From Swiss-Prot, chains A, B, C:
Annotated residues for binding of ATP: 174, 238-240, 306, 311, 319
Name this protein carries in UniProt: Glutamine synthetase
Known partners and oligomeric status: Oligomer of 12 subunits arranged in the form of two hexameric ring.
One Pfam family named in its UniProt record: Gln-synt_C
Binding annotation for Mg(2+) 1: 130, 236, 324
Function text: Catalyzes the ATP-dependent biosynthesis of glutamine from glutamate and ammonia.
Co-factor binding details: Binds 2 Mg(2+) ions per subunit.
């Protein structure tokens, strides 16, 4: 899809505004709105000058402005704006060299895919994530200097009309798994795409979910553990690799899974805590990664066991042979999370890392001399951030991740880890006020 | 003080009830009230049969009842009870062998002092702690399945009458440091005693503080960090060792401190995380042990620096030469905390452990190649508990701490660590609800 | 009705979503919504992969996913959904063998009918149930750790428009018995069908009743005893057997009832407590099965007496000769309840079990030596579950009921029986608080 069709869309729909959208390192979606008459054919080869004071690494204290370069293939009319608006996802570029910014998640995902095609291991990667959310009727939260409080108060029309709006915005939905045990938790299934296209689709997914919940007087949250004792929100990711139109993950070994797939799983397992720094970036994210029942915390693979973090779905077709990693949560930044998973898999393929043996029939039942032995995902955000700081190397292959970008990301996550670490919590008043 | 004087006190004061008090492993103070006519001369050589279903290690699923053996030298009239009551602190003994229970904090402190006298290093140990508390006008807290909340709402008569009641109950008070910056925080200074006598005095201290605050319609808390950003409650402990009436901590080295004292500091520094498991037993306790200004988190000693955890007070008398460790908090169990500190010091003296060099002029200012190098106290309760589980050895010298007692203590602390770990906190709703 | 007509219905009505519905062992109706463009001709020969974490036996801890295979003959447009939805009832199949799941109520009902046709006793079975419900204006209930509470606050338009919506959804209604004594209690009469078709119709019946009551701001409940002293909700079931188009229940014996019918009644009477485990599955269900007036608790048959649980309606046509069993309640799972009744009748026919003699003129008036003699239905849910555990055999004939399915059902019922058993009830506070 080119720019000429975008101008044709502008004239066709009588678009008044164009909303240029990009993503922080935090994953939040930033936008600049320009009038539709400011969009010309030349606008797609210079972009728009932008002031980079966005939170995170973009708050670099030496530098000048950045460039918003739109991707014309991502244009879609916004369903929620009263004045007809055309949404375009943009990359952040350095104004001089006109190259992708080092601290741009979308540019990093594009670099990861380019490095994939460069190494010759595969031609493309297919990602299907399963982001789950919570729908609540109401919620009030706050934390002043004299205390804290939170209070959450828990239809088919909302779910169906979410699916309708998602299909308006170019997503191909194919199910909707409302859950009656742990009521409130929903998940819409969508079709697989490549890495950066699927990350853009996740951003659209969250946008639609939030706004449709708003219009029905509800509140949706993609927060990994919004509520005590009830099951948390996860985002399982199915990965496949394709070269010239055939799976590299289809083979003859365990559960019909190929040798390259086994090294992919080995690479994911080895770096899973550095990955956890990016796939599980919040402190809330580790209140659902606690050892127990149905918790994706054991770093091993099994088609049968459902305590293993890496699952191998059984499909009656060799053309659909993928691996599902289950520890990521929907609070991740899709670009950074997906790039981290891809690079871990590529480092596993490159170094012939063997995962080991399938943990078919060994759940959290605490085997006498195996519960401690099996690798686990990070236990807290500090541990994941420290392991990322130590294990930068697999992210730096091919120049996808800069040391400066990783440093800025880690500092930005730490300034929230510390705010959580130093406030006193009401459960500690319940337990330790008298003590 | 003997039992005959206790019976004389019963007849003299017209005592109606006798309140036998002991301490959990959690540090909470348990009691059994018996009528004064049940107290005879024989009562002081059989004790009282007790059902040991108290929380913690005392909930042992094989065993029968325990024996409450009173210490007649700890008898004191209760100021707060309408019907004249005589308080007596008791030890928990095994009914058959009639020996101190292995999971009894008071028995463990007595064993630690007996091991001190046995090793011949010193004859007695003097402990002076400085427990600080917060006085609030009101507080409401809670945590249901649909949220959490806490709300704290912040005179000379209360402080003075606390000191009066403490001197009624045998404590020798000598100051009262109300603090105007960080209003609400108080601390009463008292005179030094030996380990187990000082721990009993800390229990009396907390009892008096809580009840006097109750009667004035206030709420006192010995909780290490009850309130955000304001300075937390600590319990600095001054240790001295005496043999035949002279300090072993008085010498000619740094700040007039002796060689035995230097090995004591070395032993405290080496085991400071296993100690932290006992001196800093709550998860709240590590919201005040965060690196920063005036935080006793650097494991080093200095008479001048006040970022070092171990201070060496300057006193114009060789007869008062002590070391102050500043990381313990008032939520500790005085018996277990003091026994842990004493045993760490004794292991340092026994193994000639040298602390190193004084960190006189190096605060938290982050030296280029020293902030990471210097040992730190544990960063979380899980880390402290794991280090205790790994570093049992110094606690087991002389049989003071049993493996079974340590295991029960660690499990009892973990069941609260986990409850804190798995609830979602309102600050995480502030930070991650939209994310 | 085939799949081609279902695709034609999709195109004709402009259906946007397809709602695939199945039933728990608890009887609750579960659903998965897929977009209408995901429904193709091939979709009706592979089904949809489903995650079987549904409550009950489906929570089996070894197994992988299940298959939702739709029944194209059950397709009906949903009247209550804003976005046009097509409802299809589905069976749960094992993905490999592609056979009916052992713990699937609908598959069990299909197996029961297949076993009926296999044994050669009859060709088809006609079931007509009479489910009664309560319409309330409002209700609030709850049970916390500090108490419990319930409060129920009690037109022709609602009843008529229920009948209209039921006839929209393929049901053939033929009456509506609002009751003025015991106001609030309603019942819609519908036409007889075969077992599994009638069970599907009961599910539609409950769905329509609940949602139509919702839209008028009411609350309908199929709960056997929602209110004290007033008459409870039952579900009388008329059974008939047909072979080559003629009743096997039409004959010349008592009330024009045939010999095969008499053995059917004998088989129902013999196993009536194992049946009660399935037809009366709640603890509430035995607050209406209490001996007294108009209570269907005496295990005997009579055309005249209305204290007998099994009635023989008098019809002026040999083509309508059926037996009515009156103990089942609308909280039953229609598939399991109907399969249990059919298998009890078939075991009675197979073993030539004679019911005995009609109890024409013997009500609950307590005959001197007959009130104790006559068999009774189970007195509590525990007794019914124990009798089911002991009397599995008649359910296992022909492989309809698996031991594993029965075990899972019993455990799932017990986990609710125990929750009811261990909470204290407000009537026990009225009676025993002072005592
Ligand atoms: Ni168009
Ligand atoms: Ni999944
Ligand atoms: Ni005296
Ligand atoms: Ni001090
Ligand atoms: Ni039609
Ligand atoms: Ni009837």
């Amino acid at each position: 899809m080119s720019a000429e069709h975008v101008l044709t869309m502008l004239n066709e729909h009588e678009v008044k505004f164009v909303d240029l959208r990009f993503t922080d390192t935090k994953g939040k979606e930033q936008h600049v709105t320009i009038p539709a008459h400011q969009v010309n054919a030349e606008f797609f080869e210079e972009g728009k000058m932008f002031d980079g004071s966005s939170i995170g690494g973009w708050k670099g204290i030496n530098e000048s402005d950045m460039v918003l370069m739109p991707d014309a293939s991502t244009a879609v009319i916004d369903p929620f704006f009263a004045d007809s608006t055309l949404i375009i996802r943009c990359d952040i570029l350095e104004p001089g060299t006109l190259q992708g910014y080092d601290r741009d998640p979308r540019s990093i995902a594009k670099r990861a895919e380019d490095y994939l095609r460069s190494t010759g291991i595969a031609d493309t990667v297919l990602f299907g994530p399963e982001p789950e959310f919570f729908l609540f009727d109401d919620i009030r939260f706050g934390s002043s200097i004299s205390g804290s409080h939170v209070a959450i108060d828990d239809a088919q029309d909302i779910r169906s009309e979410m699916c309708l709006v998602m299909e308006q915005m170019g997503l191909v939905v194919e199910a909707h798994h409302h859950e009656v045990a742990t009521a409130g938790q929903n998940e819409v299934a969508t079709r697989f795409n490549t890495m950066t296209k699927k990350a853009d689709e996740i951003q659209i997914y969250k946008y639609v979910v939030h706004n449709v919940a708003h219009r029905f007087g509800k509140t949706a949250t993609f927060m990994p553990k919004p509520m005590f004792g009830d099951n948390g929100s996860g985002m399982h990711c199915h990965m496949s690799l394709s070269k010239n139109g055939v799976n590299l993950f289809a083979g003859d070994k365990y559960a019909g899974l190929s040798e390259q797939a086994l090294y992919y799983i080995g690479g994911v397992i080895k770096h899973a805590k550095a990955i956890n720094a990016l796939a599980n970036p919040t402190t809330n994210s580790y209140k659902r990664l606690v050892p127990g029942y149905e918790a994706p915390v054991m770093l091993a693979y099994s088609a049968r066991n459902r305590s293993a973090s890496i699952r191998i779905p059984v499909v009656s077709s060799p053309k659909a042979r993928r691996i599902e990693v289950r520890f990521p949560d929907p609070a991740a930044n899709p670009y950074l999370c997906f790039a981290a998973l891809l690079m871990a898999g590529l480092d596993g393929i490159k170094n012939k890392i063997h995962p080991g043996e399938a943990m078919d029939k060994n759940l959290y039942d605490l085997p006498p001399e195996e519960a401690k032995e099996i690798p686990q995902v990070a236990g807290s955000l500090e541990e994941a951030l420290n392991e990322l700081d130590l294990d930068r190397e697999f992210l730096k292959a091919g120049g996808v991740f800069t040391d400066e970008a990783i440093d800025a990301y880690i500092a930005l996550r730490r300034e929230e880890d510390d705010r959580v670490r130093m406030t006193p919590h009401p459960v500690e008043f319940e337990l330790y006020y008298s003590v």
